[PDB]
Design an enzyme around this catalytic site. Sequence first.
Site, mmCIF file in Angstrom:
data_model
loop_
_atom_site.group_PDB
_atom_site.id
_atom_site.type_symbol
_atom_site.label_atom_id
_atom_site.label_comp_id
_atom_site.label_asym_id
_atom_site.label_seq_id
_atom_site.Cartn_x
_atom_site.Cartn_y
_atom_site.Cartn_z
ATOM 1 N N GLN A 105 0.859 -1.224 0.000
ATOM 2 C CA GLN A 105 0.000 0.000 0.000
ATOM 3 C C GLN A 105 0.876 1.248 0.000
ATOM 4 O O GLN A 105 0.559 2.205 -0.739
ATOM 5 C CB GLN A 105 -1.009 -0.084 1.140
ATOM 6 C CG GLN A 105 -2.107 0.959 1.040
ATOM 7 C CD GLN A 105 -3.129 0.886 2.155
ATOM 8 O OE1 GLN A 105 -2.792 0.634 3.325
ATOM 9 N NE2 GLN A 105 -4.319 1.381 1.852
ATOM 10 N N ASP A 108 2.424 1.733 -3.426
ATOM 11 C CA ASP A 108 1.331 2.076 -4.358
ATOM 12 C C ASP A 108 1.015 3.568 -4.178
ATOM 13 O O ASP A 108 0.919 4.289 -5.157
ATOM 14 C CB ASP A 108 0.077 1.252 -4.051
ATOM 15 C CG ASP A 108 -1.087 1.576 -4.936
ATOM 16 O OD1 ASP A 108 -1.626 2.716 -4.779
ATOM 17 O OD2 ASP A 108 -1.501 0.670 -5.725
ATOM 18 N N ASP A 110 2.932 6.005 -3.051
ATOM 19 C CA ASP A 110 4.094 6.818 -3.560
ATOM 20 C C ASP A 110 3.915 7.030 -5.071
ATOM 21 O O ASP A 110 4.280 8.103 -5.579
ATOM 22 C CB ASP A 110 5.393 6.083 -3.245
ATOM 23 C CG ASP A 110 6.648 6.947 -3.394
ATOM 24 O OD1 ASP A 110 6.858 7.533 -4.476
ATOM 25 O OD2 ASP A 110 7.435 6.967 -2.434
ATOM 26 N N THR A 184 3.747 11.816 -7.877
ATOM 27 C CA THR A 184 4.930 11.621 -8.736
ATOM 28 C C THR A 184 5.120 10.137 -9.028
ATOM 29 O O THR A 184 5.020 9.306 -8.091
ATOM 30 C CB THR A 184 6.211 12.229 -8.143
ATOM 31 O OG1 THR A 184 6.553 11.388 -7.049
ATOM 32 C CG2 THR A 184 6.022 13.667 -7.725
ATOM 33 N N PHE A 186 7.833 8.740 -9.909
ATOM 34 C CA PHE A 186 9.072 8.221 -9.293
ATOM 35 C C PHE A 186 8.757 7.643 -7.908
ATOM 36 O O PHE A 186 7.844 8.113 -7.166
ATOM 37 C CB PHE A 186 10.166 9.289 -9.284
ATOM 38 C CG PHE A 186 10.333 9.917 -10.637
ATOM 39 C CD1 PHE A 186 10.930 9.212 -11.647
ATOM 40 C CD2 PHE A 186 9.801 11.174 -10.916
ATOM 41 C CE1 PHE A 186 11.039 9.736 -12.929
ATOM 42 C CE2 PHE A 186 9.901 11.698 -12.201
ATOM 43 C CZ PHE A 186 10.504 10.971 -13.208
ATOM 44 N N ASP A 188 9.872 7.954 -4.709
ATOM 45 C CA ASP A 188 10.647 9.138 -4.280
ATOM 46 C C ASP A 188 10.181 9.653 -2.911
ATOM 47 O O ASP A 188 10.538 10.808 -2.590
ATOM 48 C CB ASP A 188 10.544 10.201 -5.379
ATOM 49 C CG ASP A 188 9.163 10.750 -5.618
ATOM 50 O OD1 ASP A 188 8.199 10.189 -5.012
ATOM 51 O OD2 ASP A 188 9.036 11.759 -6.435
ATOM 52 N N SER A 190 7.240 10.681 -2.174
ATOM 53 C CA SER A 190 6.203 11.721 -2.358
ATOM 54 C C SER A 190 5.070 11.464 -1.353
ATOM 55 O O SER A 190 4.355 12.408 -1.022
ATOM 56 C CB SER A 190 5.698 11.802 -3.782
ATOM 57 O OG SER A 190 5.232 10.545 -4.242
ATOM 58 N N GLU A 258 -6.508 6.288 5.855
ATOM 59 C CA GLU A 258 -7.545 5.367 5.325
ATOM 60 C C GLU A 258 -7.663 4.130 6.223
ATOM 61 O O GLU A 258 -8.791 3.657 6.456
ATOM 62 C CB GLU A 258 -7.231 4.933 3.882
ATOM 63 C CG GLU A 258 -8.253 3.966 3.346
ATOM 64 C CD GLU A 258 -7.901 2.479 3.362
ATOM 65 O OE1 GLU A 258 -6.728 2.146 3.628
ATOM 66 O OE2 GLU A 258 -8.820 1.632 3.066
ATOM 67 N N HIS A 351 -5.380 -5.900 -2.397
ATOM 68 C CA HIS A 351 -6.734 -5.970 -1.785
ATOM 69 C C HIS A 351 -7.025 -7.402 -1.302
ATOM 70 O O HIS A 351 -7.773 -7.577 -0.286
ATOM 71 C CB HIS A 351 -7.769 -5.356 -2.724
ATOM 72 C CG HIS A 351 -7.554 -3.886 -2.885
ATOM 73 N ND1 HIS A 351 -8.237 -3.134 -3.840
ATOM 74 C CD2 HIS A 351 -6.781 -3.025 -2.180
ATOM 75 C CE1 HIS A 351 -7.837 -1.879 -3.746
ATOM 76 N NE2 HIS A 351 -6.963 -1.756 -2.722
HETATM 77 C C1 HEM Z 1 -6.854 -2.116 4.486
HETATM 78 C C2 HEM Z 1 -6.061 -1.873 3.439
HETATM 79 C C3 HEM Z 1 -6.490 -1.100 2.242
HETATM 80 C C4 HEM Z 1 -7.592 -0.288 2.071
HETATM 81 C C5 HEM Z 1 -8.658 0.207 3.041
HETATM 82 C C6 HEM Z 1 -7.592 0.138 0.684
HETATM 83 C C7 HEM Z 1 -8.530 1.041 0.116
HETATM 84 C C8 HEM Z 1 -8.528 1.516 -1.193
HETATM 85 C C9 HEM Z 1 -9.520 2.407 -1.778
HETATM 86 C C10 HEM Z 1 -10.821 2.872 -1.115
HETATM 87 C C11 HEM Z 1 -9.107 2.645 -3.032
HETATM 88 C C12 HEM Z 1 -9.782 3.502 -4.061
HETATM 89 C C13 HEM Z 1 -10.668 2.705 -5.028
HETATM 90 C C14 HEM Z 1 -11.216 3.508 -6.171
HETATM 91 O O1 HEM Z 1 -11.922 4.542 -5.963
HETATM 92 O O2 HEM Z 1 -11.056 3.118 -7.340
HETATM 93 C C15 HEM Z 1 -7.862 1.932 -3.208
HETATM 94 C C16 HEM Z 1 -7.119 2.031 -4.346
HETATM 95 C C17 HEM Z 1 -5.901 1.387 -4.534
HETATM 96 N N1 HEM Z 1 -5.366 0.499 -3.683
HETATM 97 FE FE1 HEM Z 1 -6.024 -0.076 -1.904
HETATM 98 N N2 HEM Z 1 -6.562 -0.415 0.085
HETATM 99 C C18 HEM Z 1 -5.854 -1.190 0.944
HETATM 100 C C19 HEM Z 1 -4.696 -1.949 0.687
HETATM 101 C C20 HEM Z 1 -3.950 -1.876 -0.454
HETATM 102 C C21 HEM Z 1 -2.833 -2.675 -0.714
HETATM 103 C C22 HEM Z 1 -2.295 -3.652 0.328
HETATM 104 C C23 HEM Z 1 -2.402 -2.359 -1.977
HETATM 105 C C24 HEM Z 1 -1.214 -2.887 -2.708
HETATM 106 C C25 HEM Z 1 -0.393 -3.856 -2.334
HETATM 107 C C26 HEM Z 1 -3.306 -1.351 -2.488
HETATM 108 C C27 HEM Z 1 -3.250 -0.755 -3.727
HETATM 109 C C28 HEM Z 1 -4.186 0.169 -4.239
HETATM 110 C C29 HEM Z 1 -3.944 0.815 -5.528
HETATM 111 C C30 HEM Z 1 -2.725 0.659 -6.425
HETATM 112 C C31 HEM Z 1 -5.029 1.652 -5.704
HETATM 113 C C32 HEM Z 1 -5.253 2.633 -6.871
HETATM 114 C C33 HEM Z 1 -4.532 3.991 -6.434
HETATM 115 C C34 HEM Z 1 -4.790 5.122 -7.477
HETATM 116 O O3 HEM Z 1 -4.080 5.195 -8.528
HETATM 117 O O4 HEM Z 1 -5.791 5.914 -7.360
HETATM 118 N N3 HEM Z 1 -4.242 -1.135 -1.551
HETATM 119 N N4 HEM Z 1 -7.537 1.270 -2.076
HETATM 120 CA CA CA Z 2 6.198 9.183 -6.081
#
Ligand code: HEM
Ligand code: CA
Length: 595
Positions: A105, A108, A110, A184, A186, A188, A190, A258, A351
């Site tokens: 998380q 992700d 960053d 960003t 990178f 980094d 952020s 969050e 997730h």
């Molecule tokens: C309890 C743990 C976590 C919660 C509550 C959570 C919650 C969320 C929520 C609400 C979103 C936005 C969904 C949307 O509107 O499309 C999201 C997006 C995302 N989550 Fe999770 N998440 C969790 C864990 C993780 C983990 C463990 C990863 C990766 C290993 C991750 C990677 C992402 C990514 C890459 C996005 C898209 C970010 C973006 O470009 O906007 N999340 N998450």
């Molecule tokens: Ca960054």
Amino acid sequence: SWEVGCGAPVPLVKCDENSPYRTITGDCNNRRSPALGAANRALARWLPAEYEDGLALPFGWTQRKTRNGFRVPLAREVSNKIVGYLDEEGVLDQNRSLLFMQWGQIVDHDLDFAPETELGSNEHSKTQCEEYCIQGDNCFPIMFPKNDPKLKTQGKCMPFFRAGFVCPTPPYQSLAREQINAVTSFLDASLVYGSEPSLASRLRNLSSPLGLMAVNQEAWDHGLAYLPFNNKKPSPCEFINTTARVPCFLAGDFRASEQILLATAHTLLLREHNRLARELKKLNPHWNGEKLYQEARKILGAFIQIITFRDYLPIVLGSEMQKWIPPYQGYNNSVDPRISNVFTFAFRFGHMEVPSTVSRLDENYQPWGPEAELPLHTLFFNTWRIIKDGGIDPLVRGLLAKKSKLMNQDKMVTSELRNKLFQPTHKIHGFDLAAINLQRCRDHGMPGYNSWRGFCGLSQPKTLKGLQTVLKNKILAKKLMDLYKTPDNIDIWIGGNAEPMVERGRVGPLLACLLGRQFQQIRDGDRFWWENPGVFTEKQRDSLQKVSFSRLICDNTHITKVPLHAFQANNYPHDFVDCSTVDKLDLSPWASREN
Ligand code: HEM
Ligand SMILES: [Ca+2]
Ligand SMILES: *[C@@H]1O[C@H](CO)[C@@H](O[C@@H]2O[C@H](CO)[C@@H](O)[C@H](O)[C@H]2NC(C)=O)[C@H](O)[C@H]1NC(C)=O
Ligand SMILES: *[C@@H]1O[C@H](CO)[C@@H](O[C@@H]2O[C@H](CO)[C@@H](O)[C@H](O)[C@H]2NC(C)=O)[C@H](O)[C@H]1NC(C)=O
Ligand SMILES: *[C@@H]1O[C@H](CO)[C@@H](O)[C@H](O)[C@H]1NC(C)=O
Ligand SMILES: [Zn+2]
């Protein structure tokens, strides 16, 4: 006509070619194309966007309009029939700590954030989309299928707002809609320092010439720093518990509060900046505050890169690591460092690694008080359980001594995220992160499963039997075919995550390729990559090789017992050592001599 560059927003390019430090925005990294990897620009398209109308309407928008001759199934129906399970027994990862999930998380956050359009400021559709479940403009509600229990308790839909997009959010742009990456590209830090100049300055302590980050002035963790509160309203961290009225933290990244373990990780990183800045001031008393901030920021950025690429990615990509991320061969300024739209869905494999509970553990790694273990949904936007219940140490012990959830084809996403997710301004622990992810794949115009299989040089199954073979699972393939009707229509988030995991890894072949390619690019395409000759001195790099999450914990908490491999499943006391035996980061090579 051609509309090569739609860049009315963020036009400013004022690049110091000589600067040894990153910009906060990510601009100037690439010398020939200084906007590459900058925040507040379009996500990269590795393949062309796929919209119902070829420009911006998602598949699923128009009831009559098929994808390849078939109606796309409701996101929530896919969630119910494929992603949900009841029994949390046996679902834990026997070889990954809960820190493995939490680092994902962090990385992700960053790299990428696609925020919902802000057309909700003094707007009816802010509450009207939630109230009346009427699709239009940015309102793209997740409709419940007929047999959904939520239809009985929560009305007709879950609210959902379309992601922001480049060249004015409300109106039309040059060809297909391109969603924004607000942070960003990178790797980094952020998420510690911010991706925008205003935020980055607000986070700093400019009162002292010590290059410190601002810390909470109202609460302390046994004398150790908390992030500052975000004094803005309305606050979801106050909403959860109006008795405690503890606000969300203010970090480099919007999303830091969050859930409590993300807030905890953010807290460790802030402490580390200030620790580093204090150590550098001792070595270099002549350094002004700006220099101390930049130097500590540069070390923390290196720390995040080394943990990610040396420790994390190998145990995500397993046998695919060497295929996609060969050992480093220096900076390639022809590489596109931008995060792709598809990566922002590929990385959501995390997730399926989130387990149903969080524990607080005492200095014997035994339960901390009478409610030591809590259901995950009670910890969404929860800062009061940190300030008012023992600080971060008991949660950090939980990150070390408890396990990630294992992805399972029969048990994909815990009901804590699939039915009890809390979203700011909604007021209910009632949302479904799986449904949100599927609806967002469509919002972003994602190509389907087989387009990405082709992208990655993998077979494109056309039949039930082909899908059965690819997934190694006959029941899962049948459920996906009953809903999709062709593997070409399977949303990339569910299709990638449905594949059995590669050897020694935690994702399937399709995700290993998409993640592998993205991480290769963010490393190779980064002028400030820690291992790029000239960025650090060779002696600095010798020191940096010794960083570990174990030392990060030892240095920034009252924890004195840690594991040497923090992402592995570790049990106390057998797998734990004294902080004494754990390598330190030797900053002596940062000693700056003029006379
Ligand atoms: C309890 C743990 C976590 C919660 C509550 C959570 C919650 C969320 C929520 C609400 C979103 C936005 C969904 C949307 O509107 O499309 C999201 C997006 C995302 N989550 Fe999770 N998440 C969790 C864990 C993780 C983990 C463990 C990863 C990766 C290993 C991750 C990677 C992402 C990514 C890459 C996005 C898209 C970010 C973006 O470009 O906007 N999340 N998450
Ligand atoms: Ca960054
Ligand atoms: C900015 O940094 C200054 C300098 O350390 C902080 O002020 C000090 O505040 C602490 C209270 O936490 C006191 O123990 C010290 O006596 C103070 N030292 C000096 C030299 O003034 C200030 O709290 C920081 N501000 C923020 C917002 O983090
Ligand atoms: C809201 O936060 C308060 C403040 O901490 C919580 O109260 C604690 O509640 C339990 C009773 O169930 C006590 O044993 C603790 O010692 C309390 N501390 C204080 C200072 O009140 C309350 O449980 C929270 N409520 C919700 C809905 O989360
Ligand atoms: C630099 O990147 C380009 C484009 O991705 C690639 O084709 C080229 O082989 C790279 N250079 C090296 C030396 O790998
Ligand atoms: Zn203490």
